[PDB]
């Protein structure tokens, strides 16, 4: 995984339209793009609602939330055993490689990942909130 995969203009799945697609948030704030390689043409379920047909080869799909993209990708991986990546696209026009964020699915341990938000202690060894009183602390968990 030398570099993240770039985002081309690949064909989108066949869909008749729905009212569950992108709202104004895509225009003002952000929206997410899911791209996957399909082994064969098949009918999948849109996370917004309705049924769509994915095209053989690469597909591109823009969705409102990362959760929708990841739910659909997890469906593709667990049922159809496909591979896919997610991008975040801002209104300024800069995309952002999101899934898996390493080139390796997070459930598989991969070298080079650095532990973030790890407390090297058990849950009961957290101090009491009275000891961190009047301190800029989120809670006992962040000390």
């Amino acid at each position: 995984w030398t570099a993240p995969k770039l985002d081309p203009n690949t064909p989108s799945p066949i869909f008749g339209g729905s009212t569950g697609g992108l709202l104004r948030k895509a225009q003002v704030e952000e929206f997410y793009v899911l791209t996957w390689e399909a082994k064969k043409e098949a009918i999948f379920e849109m996370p917004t609602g309705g049924a769509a047909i994915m095209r053989k080869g690469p597909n591109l799909l823009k969705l409102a939330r990362k959760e929708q993209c990841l739910a659909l990708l997890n469906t593709f991986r667990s049922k159809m055993k496909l591979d896919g990546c997610i991008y975040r696209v801002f209104p300024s026009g800069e995309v952002q490689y999101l899934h898996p964020k390493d080139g390796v699915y997070p459930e598989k341990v991969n070298k080079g990942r650095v532990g973030a938000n790890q407390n090297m202690r058990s849950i009961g060894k957290n101090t009491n909130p009275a000891k961190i009183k009047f301190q800029g602390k989120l809670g006992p968990f962040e000390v």
Binding site: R24, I123, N128, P129, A130, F134, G139, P140, F141
Partner: protein, 732 residues
């Protein structure tokens, strides 16, 4: 980001309508504010106390001004038993001509509201007679409120702002509050009663103009400083004394007659002056207990430190609790709320039975309204006390510092406490409900003689000890022994006259219905205490969620995992206990109201017959006394109870709307709002207008609170409308 959560960045950056709601909600939670030091916390609390004290005094001044300006205080004073007090004029543009013609009561020439707060009887008893006196009082309290607002402003400036250690000075604060806030205040009130209220009760008006010229006693201060203090009790008021006149008026200013003034059915004003004097002496003495700046007095830390049981049954005793109480604002708040709620209950339970205000016992609607008021306030204050103690256990409790003291011991045997609370609650509810259902069935089956009617002989035996001669135990004051002989020198003739009279409510006769309802009350108190103590002791963690102290006082849940953790927080324990508190207080005030209504119609047999089974309460109390209330307005016009009918139905509405927030939960509503967002975004001519904050459903805790608030508001308003309308329809 926005400016409204000035105290919360995390809410300022929130892009949804939850920002507004949580900035409203967390406004007064100063301890969780960004960049909040202890010094700023204490200074802001001090100035907020100044602020709402000024609010209290403005409320009192407003009551006085409205009674002076729009009320009928003089005329009411002329005929207290045949004049309905006036609260304030109504200027409602929505009134129709029948409403304007039906709300004109008293001698008003405009629509008015009939003051059911007892302020008329109170102000008449304290010597106020004319609208000018009430106006002067209102203006003075306006000045006092302005003074306290200026004091809050001044002590917020850096020169005058006090440090944390000034607040932490416990000894000086308690010395000054006991001696001066309590003691000297009681002395000054005694001086008022002796100089103004008693002379006004005996006919002569003593205002500031003739103050300093009319001696309150025929002898001056010679009996005082020569130690002949019994001269001030030489000639009390005659039994045939008319309040506010000189017929049968004595000269004694301080005495301990006891009982009630026969014409007003209220406490003798000389008794209440002597009472406040004795309190003043006791509290001025008490306020020299602690050591501040003069090398004498106790140290509270060392008092607690030296009280450790030698056998170790209590563990390390109270060692380490001084700093716990003093550094914990939530511990202090829970203690203050606990005490204040107990006091409010005591006021409810003592004002009905021992009315301190002239012509208050004869005005039944005011008595009922005051009892309901103070009991509901007390129940809420109690719920707050326990909630703040749970908050103390989360935020302010230090297990390392409190190691071995009674508090850590409470944590150690919390399961025993909760389990025995559950046992007593289960026993009380099983047996009380079973006896009520049994009595329901026996009445239903036409054999009321087979009811389990347990005579409450213990309470009756107390009453016999206290002078009641109905039951015939005749042990302590009803019998002839040393206790009664000692009592029969000063107080006991008046007390026995009061307690053995059928008219007053000093110690009402007790029956099996009173047994069953007091056990229902005990059920309610034990269950509410179960919920609240469970919340407080499991606040810091339980087996379902060991690390509950890391999530704060109020959080929604810990997810559906581990079986489900809905309503797991101590805040949620409070939220659940408020229902039981409302239920218990309603039981108590239903008992009060029905027993007193039976007394006031003169047929106490109705309650004594129908209070043993639930259908009797549903029929002869709720259904029976709701007739005139629901007929406040109807197709055949309306009367003066139409407002209370509307409020009755209003409270029903709020109660039901609360049920919506309590039963339906967030996630149905979130999806519904999502569809609504789509609709508004895709509607022509409406997409021109766009929300600044993203509309979202109410959060879980927020909606639990909103539903609880609606539940409680509808509860209180419905019952207030009922207790006032029924009592005024039957008695005015």
């Amino acid at each position: 980001a926005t400016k409204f959560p000035k105290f919360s960045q995390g809410l300022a950056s929130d892009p949804t309508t939850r920002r507004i709601w949580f900035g409203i909600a967390t406004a007064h939670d100063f301890e969780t504010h960004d960049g909040m030091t202890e010094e700023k916390l204490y200074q802001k609390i001090f100035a907020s106390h100044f602020g709402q004290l000024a609010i209290i005094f403005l409320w009192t001044s407003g009551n006085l001004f409205h009674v002076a300006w729009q009320g009928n205080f003089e005329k009411w004073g002329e005929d207290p038993l045949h004049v309905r007090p006036i609260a304030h004029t109504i200027w409602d543009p929505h009134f129709g001509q029948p409403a304007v013609e039906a709300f004109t009561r008293g001698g008003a020439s405009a629509p008015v509201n009939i003051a059911y707060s007892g302020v008329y009887q109170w102000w008449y008893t304290i010597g106020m007679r004319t609208n000018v006196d009430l106006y002067n009082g209102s203006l003075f309290l306006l000045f006092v409120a302005g003074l306290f607002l200026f004091a809050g402003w001044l002590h917020l400036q850096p020169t005058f702002a006090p440090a944390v250690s000034w607040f932490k000075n416990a000894e000086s604060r308690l010395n000054h509050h006991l001696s001066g806030l309590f003691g000297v205040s009681s002395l000054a009130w005694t001086g008022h009663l002796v100089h103004v209220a008693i002379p006004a009760s005996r006919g002569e008006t003593v205002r500031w103009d003739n103050f300093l010229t009319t001696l309150p006693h025929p002898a001056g201060l010679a009996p005082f400083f020569t130690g002949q203090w019994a001269v001030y009790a030489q000639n009390p008021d005659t039994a045939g004394h008319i309040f506010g006149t000189s017929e049968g008026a004595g000269t004694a200013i301080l005495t301990f007659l006891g009982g009630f003034h026969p014409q007003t059915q209220s406490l003798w004003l000389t008794d209440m002056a002597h009472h406040h004097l004795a309190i003043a002496v006791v509290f001025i003495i008490a306020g020299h207990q602690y050591r501040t700046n003069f090398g004498i007095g106790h140290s509270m830390k060392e008092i607690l430190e030296a009280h450790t049981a030698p056998s170790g049954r209590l563990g390390a005793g109270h060692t380490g609790l001084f700093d716990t109480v003093n550094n914990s604002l939530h511990f202090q708040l829970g203690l203050a709320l606990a005490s204040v709620g107990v006091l409010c209950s005591l006021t409810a339970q003592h004002m009905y039975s021992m009315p301190p205000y002239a012509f208050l016992a004869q005005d039944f609607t005011t008595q009922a309204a005051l009892y309901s008021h103070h009991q509901y306030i007390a129940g809420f204050i109690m719920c707050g006390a326990f909630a703040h103690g749970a908050i103390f256990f989360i935020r302010d409790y230090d297990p390392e510092a409190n190691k071995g003291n009674v508090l850590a011991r409470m944590l150690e045997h919390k399961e025993a406490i909760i389990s025995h609370l559950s046992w007593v609650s289960l026993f009380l509810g099983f047996h009380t409900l079973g006896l009520y259902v049994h009595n329901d069935v026996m009445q239903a089956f036409g054999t009321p003689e087979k009811q389990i009617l347990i005579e409450p002989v213990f309470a009756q035996w107390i009453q016999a000890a206290q002078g009641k001669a109905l039951y015939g135990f005749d042990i302590l004051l009803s019998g002839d022994n040393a206790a009664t002989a000692a009592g029969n020198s000063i107080y006991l003739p008046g007390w026995l006259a009061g307690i053995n009279s059928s008219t007053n409510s000093l110690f009402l006769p007790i029956g099996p219905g009173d047994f069953l309802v007091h056990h229902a009350i005990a059920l309610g108190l034990h269950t509410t205490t179960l919920i609240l103590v469970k919340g407080a002791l499991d606040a810091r963690g339980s087996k379902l969620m060991p690390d509950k102290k890391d999530f704060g006082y109020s959080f929604p849940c810990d997810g559906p995992g581990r079986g489900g953790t809905c309503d797991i927080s101590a805040w949620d324990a409070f939220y659940l206990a408020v229902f039981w508190e409302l239920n218990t207080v309603s039981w108590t005030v239903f008992y009060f109201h029905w027993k007193h209504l039976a007394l006031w119609q003169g047929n106490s047999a109705q309650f004594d017959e129908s209070s043993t089974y639930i259908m009797g309460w549903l029929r002869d109390y709720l259904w029976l006394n709701s007739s005139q209330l629901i007929n406040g307005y109807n197709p055949f016009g309306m009367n003066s109870l139409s407002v209370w009918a509307w409020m009755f139905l209003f409270g029903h509405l709020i109660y039901a709307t609360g049920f919506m927030f309590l039963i339906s939960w967030r996630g149905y509503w979130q999806e519904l709002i999502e569809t609504l967002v789509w609709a508004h975004e895709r509607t022509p001519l409406a997409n021109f207008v766009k929300w600044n904050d993203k509309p979202v459903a109410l959060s879980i805790v927020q909606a639990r609170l909103v539903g609880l608030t609606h539940f409680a508001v509808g509860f209180v308003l419905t019952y207030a409308a009922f207790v006032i309308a029924s009592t005024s329809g039957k008695f005015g």
